[PDB]
């Protein structure tokens, strides 16, 4: 119908933006129309938002400042719009330093109508923003590394040495029980120094534990300083599993002092690399009562010496040291198995601007992915969480993994507002919720439900106001993955009662029959008024229509439904196919917008978003003709055998286009059918040329006229019917130039018969 597919505008392929969604915007003050597009993070462009305009017969894009900047992976970008301004949300990851968890929620920016920053919102630690009484206005009427330096000198007899091995094993087992990030290395020293196993081997706890029992005694002189040096050189390095940011610990286990060590203790301890290593000295045996060995122990250990230095009567007493060492070495990990709650709520997953201050944001991951929505006041910086009432615990568990808040929308009634939400996983076939308010308590309840499992009913919502009176009349709910043969999709059109606000199914829409994979209903949008009848017109996308067929040059479609007084059309008025737009388009029809004049004609236009590109379609003027005819004589006298004069004048009855433009380059083509319906006609054209396929150029005014003559048919006229009214049918048609034309050529109104009948 009305959309001009012969003249598309496309963002350059492999261009700076890899479009994920396209969106039209207009500043109500300056009347400037932009094309906002989104993109994932890439080395070329940090994203996430660009504003694009039509420069040199092409779409050129520049980024929008004061928008949040994602880092690393693409978690998700969400953008919405209203006459109040533009809302941006980015899913962000914050790794809390203390514990082994993650928080995944949104950071948002609310720009004004002209894209100037107004407010910002970070949603980490949400319990400090919340307000369980905020009024819901509706117009009411780096880990830890430990290196053990085991003394193997012969003074330890084999029994004591098995006891020492058991101490190391119990230390490892105990530490792993309460420190998940801990890692271990073992260096056995003496006459020679010997890595039993470095930090890398400790990633397999069972094997490392096994290696401990496998040790063999070196049994020679005590070279402790060399053991420390070797731990410094070989254990604590990036080449053997050590990490720079991680804490570094030592546990020395000796039964005597140094004697005949080639290295020097004081230089080893003072070495540049030692700075930052927490040395613990464990002393065993009677020798340590002597002052010199006590000095050596106090020298190896780090102060406070009472908590790092140690002494034990015999090798049996080691089993008791575990408590003190565990307290003094490993910091408490804290709670890790706590419930989720708002930690992964993913706020900003969907969005909606309610007015200048208030936004409605989706919270799919709210409570074990139960979902919900946050009603946020961007000025006071306080919000209320709305969700399904938990009731008993048996019911709360049943609501898990519904994904409520996957999609959010607002319905406009004659006197009040109403918030609706999407739960595509509800009971495994989907549902749509609605906020029921009863004094203090406001909560979501199911109103509509899907029928097929896995169809993702409620994943897309589109309230439609047909006559633009400020009151929603229909609600479009998509189930894009509906399955008959493959995933074809389905769309449910729901009528809204003017009395109670209830819902009642009116129609079920499906894509073109012939495609098993279409994903029809994945994207829908109310595109303002395109046909120029002052009724809203909807668009739907089938991004998989034609996928994998032939060379796969292009796939995806867009259906255009026109609105009527009785509701949405039964069948689409247009079907734009990716292959007829341009080569290379993949997933044409997964984002859409319309209703703003971007070409300069003053007529509302369209934008369709490919998975990687954006397309802008110019709308065409819709022309309605008015046919008038005059006769001379006004009626044929009985027995008349002369020639009848006819004056046929067409007129542009539509104010869509200026009179001086006429029909531009389109030629008016009309034919005359004289005395239609009679087996043998009583009149006929004076010249067959003059009345068949008559092509004419418009006068450049608001009217066009022609003169024609008709003559009686040859031979005697049948007596069966001699005085019945003669029917003349003037069928007209517009012949438009082929190709890419500067102005959008007119298109005849599809919903008006392209002909008229007059009688003589």
């Amino acid at each position, epitope marked *: 119908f009305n959309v001009d597919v012969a003249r598309p505008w496309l963002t350059p392929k492999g261009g700076a933006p890899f479009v994920l969604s396209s969106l039209l915007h207009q500043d109500p003050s300056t009347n400037q129309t932009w094309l906002l597009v989104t993109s994932p993070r890439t080395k070329r462009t940090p994203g996430p938002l660009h504003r694009c305009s*039509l420069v*040199q017969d092409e779409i050129l894009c520049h980024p929008v400042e004061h928008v949040p900047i994602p880092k690393g992976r693409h978690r998700g970008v969400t953008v919405v719009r209203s006459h109040h301004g533009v809302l941006i949300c980015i899913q962000v990851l914050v790794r809390r330093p203390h514990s082994l968890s993650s928080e995944l929620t949104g950071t948002c920016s609310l720009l004004g109508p002209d894209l100037r920053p107004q407010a910002q919102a970070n949603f980490f630690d949400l319990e400090n923003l919340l307000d369980p009484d905020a009024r819901v206005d509706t117009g009411d009427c780096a880990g830890t590394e430990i290196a053990i330096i085991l003394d193997g000198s012969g003074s330890i007899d084999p029994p004591d040495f098995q006891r020492a091995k058991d101490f190391i094993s119990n230390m490892m087992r105990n530490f792993y029980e309460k420190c998940f990030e801990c890692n271990f290395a073992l260096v056995q020293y003496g006459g020679v120094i010997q890595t039993e196993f470095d930090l890398r081997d400790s990633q397999d706890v069972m094997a490392s534990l096994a290696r401990v029992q496998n040790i063999t005694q070196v049994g020679s002189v005590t070279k402790t300083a060399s053991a420390m040096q070797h731990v410094l050189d070989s254990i604590f390095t990036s080449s053997h599993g050590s990490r720079r940011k991680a804490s570094k610990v030592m546990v020395v286990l000796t039964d005597g002092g140094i004697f005949e060590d080639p290295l020097n203790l004081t230089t080893v301890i003072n070495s540049p690399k030692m700075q930052g290593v927490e040395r613990f000295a464990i002393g065993v045996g009677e020798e340590f009562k002597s002052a010199r060995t006590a000095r050596e122990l106090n020298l190896i250990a780090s102060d406070p010496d009472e908590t790092h230095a140690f002494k034990v009567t015999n090798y049996m007493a080691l089993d008791g040291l575990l408590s003190k060492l565990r307290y003094n070495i490993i910091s408490m990990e804290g709670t890790v198995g706590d419930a989720l709650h708002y930690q992964l709520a993913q706020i900003g997953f969907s969005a909606q601007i309610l007015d200048e201050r208030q936004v409605l944001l989706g919270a799919v991951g709210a409570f074990d992915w139960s979902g919900g929505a946050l009603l946020y006041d961007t000025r006071s910086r306080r919000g209320r969480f709305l969700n399904q009432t938990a009731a008993a615990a048996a019911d709360a568990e049943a609501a898990q993994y519904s994904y409520l808040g996957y999609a959010v929308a607002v319905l406009h009634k004659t006197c009040s507002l109403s918030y609706i939400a999407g739960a595509p996983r509800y009971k495994h076939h989907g549902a749509v919720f609605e906020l029921q308010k009863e004094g203090r308590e406001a909560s979501f309840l199911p109103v509509l439900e899907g029928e097929q499992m896995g169809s993702y009913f409620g994943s897309e919502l589109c309230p439609v106001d047909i006559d633009m009176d400020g009151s929603t009349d229909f609600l479009l709910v998509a189930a894009p993955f509906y399955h008959v043969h493959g995933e074809e999709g389905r769309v449910y059109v729901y009528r809204l009662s003017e009395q109670d606000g209830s819902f009642s199914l009116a129609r079920i829409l499906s894509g073109h029959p012939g495609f098993t994979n279409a994903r029809f209903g994945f994207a829908m949008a109310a595109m303002g008024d395109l046909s120029q009848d002052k009724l809203t017109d909807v668009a739907i996308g089938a991004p998989l229509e034609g996928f994998g067929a032939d060379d796969g040059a292009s796939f995806g479609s867009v259906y255009i439904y026109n609105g009527h007084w009785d509701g949405l059309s039964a069948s689409p008025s247009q079907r734009i196919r990716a292959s007829t737009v341009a080569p290379g388009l993949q997933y044409f029809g997964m984002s859409m917008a319309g209703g703003f004049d971007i070409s300069g004609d003053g007529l509302a236009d369209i934008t369709v978003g490919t998975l990687g590109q954006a397309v802008v379609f110019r709308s065409r003027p819709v022309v309605r003709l008015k046919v008038s005819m005059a006769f001379t004589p006004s009626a044929l006298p009985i027995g008349f055998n002369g020639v009848v004069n006819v004056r046929l004048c067409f007129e542009i009855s539509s104010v869509t286009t200026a009179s001086e*433009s006429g029909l*531009r380059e389109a*030629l008016l083509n009309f034919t005359l059918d004289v005395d239609v319906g009679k087996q043998r006609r009583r009149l006929q054209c004076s010249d067959v040329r003059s009345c068949l396929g008559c092509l004419r150029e418009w006068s450049s005014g608001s009217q066009l006229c022609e003169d024609l003559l008709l003559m009686p048919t040859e031979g005697e006229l049948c007596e069966e019917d001699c005085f019945s009214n003669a029917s003349v049918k003037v069928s007209y048609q517009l012949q*438009t*130039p082929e190709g890419q034309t*500067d102005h959008p050529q007119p298109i005849l109104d599809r919903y008006t018969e392209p002909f008229a009948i007059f009688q003589l």
Partner: antibody
Amino acid sequence: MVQLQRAGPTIVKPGSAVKLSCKATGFAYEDYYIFWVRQREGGNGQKWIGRIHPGSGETKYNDKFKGKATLTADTEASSAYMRLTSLTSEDTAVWYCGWERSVGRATFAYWGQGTSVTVSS
Amino acid sequence: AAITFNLAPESLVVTAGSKVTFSCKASQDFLNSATKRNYLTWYQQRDGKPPKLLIYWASARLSGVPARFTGSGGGGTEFTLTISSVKAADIGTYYCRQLRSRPLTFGGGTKLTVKQ
């Protein structure tokens, strides 16, 4: 009726830039296109330059003048402009703004009076 | 790329009251398949004056142009502007012009001269 006026002749040294003008009257300035053509002496005839749509600011250029000319419009003053960058002794010619016929297709239905540019040191 | 024109003869020697006929030919078809019109335009220029529009489509005259001018020139690749009876006011240069595709190009022109 429709008529177009221009600034007039201009003498500029080599290497400079000139911003011609083409005022428009008698019609809606934001509904029709404005085309520019370069007529040169010595049998060079005429060669099309580009277009501009004042209602939207959108432009299109012949590849030969892709980096040379730069058209713009002023909706309030109803006056268009061409900007020639790094003029050379070869750019000497007479230039014409135009207005496409409302019906049918005729790129230059109306012309301005004429403006002559000479690039001499 | 661009459509090329060959407007010959470069000039015509004519006498008042004698039929005249120009001719230019295009390297590509000008018959827009839909409207069936040929997108060629004819211009007239008097020395020291801006050009003027004579015939927009291959055979359609502009308002104000005297009837003695005729477009003719069908085919889609060969066109011929004909004057039934040349006159003094008709002495000038005529250019035919591409109108179907970009870049838009002219044919160089043909100048009329009175015979002596």
